[model samples]
Target chain A: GIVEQCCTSICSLYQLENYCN
Target chain B: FVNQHLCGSHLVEALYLVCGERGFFYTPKA
Candidate 1:
């Protein structure tokens, strides 16, 4: 009984911005 | 299913490239 599942792609740029700022 | 099947999945890997020389054969499928 799983709620939801899906594939996702997160760009490295987005993560970098979050850490830098 | 031919040209575009080579690009992405309909959510599954269409081509099963085996490293061995044994198994059933299915080819040129699209």
Candidate 2:
């Protein structure tokens, strides 16, 4: 089961930052 | 907005793709 908007924004932002830098 | 993109770097590079476990949301923009 998943909510309509329970995204990993913080986690995704961190992950993307790590990957970008 | 599409112009001067990062993925579209001036330098050549490889393309990466993958999926990750996550939540869901409506396709319609909120």
Candidate 3:
């Protein structure tokens, strides 16, 4: 799930949270 | 870590989506 984890990180980093989770 | 490159790619995709199409320079695989 590395790919998805990075998405979660991106979501947090960019403040686009829910879209990724 | 060669196999982990996918994570970087996913990160780029996430960036492209979050930062806007123009802000993140993401060239789709050719």
| Backbone clash count for every predicted candidate, in the order shown | 0, 0, 0
**Each candidate's lDDT (Cα)?**
0.22, 0.23, 0.44
The model with the greatest DockQ is 3
Candidate 1 on B1-30: residue-level lDDT in tens? 122212224212322232122322222241
Candidates ranked by lDDT: 3, 2, 1
* Candidate 2, A1-21: lDDT as tens digits: 011111311222222333321
DockQ ranking of the models: 3, 2, 1
TM-score for each model: 0.16, 0.17, 0.34
**Model 1 iRMSD vs. native:** 17.1
Fnat of candidates, each listed: 0.00, 0.00, 0.09
Report the lDDT tens digits of candidate 3 across residue range A1-21.
434444333225434332332
Query: What interface RMSD does candidate 3 have?
Result: 9.9
Using DockQ as the yardstick, the better of models 1 and 3 is: 3
Per-residue error (Å), model 1, residue A5: 21
Model 3: fraction of the reference interface contacts it also forms = 0.09
| Model 2 residue B25 lDDT score | 25
Off by over 4 Å in 1: A1-11, B1-30
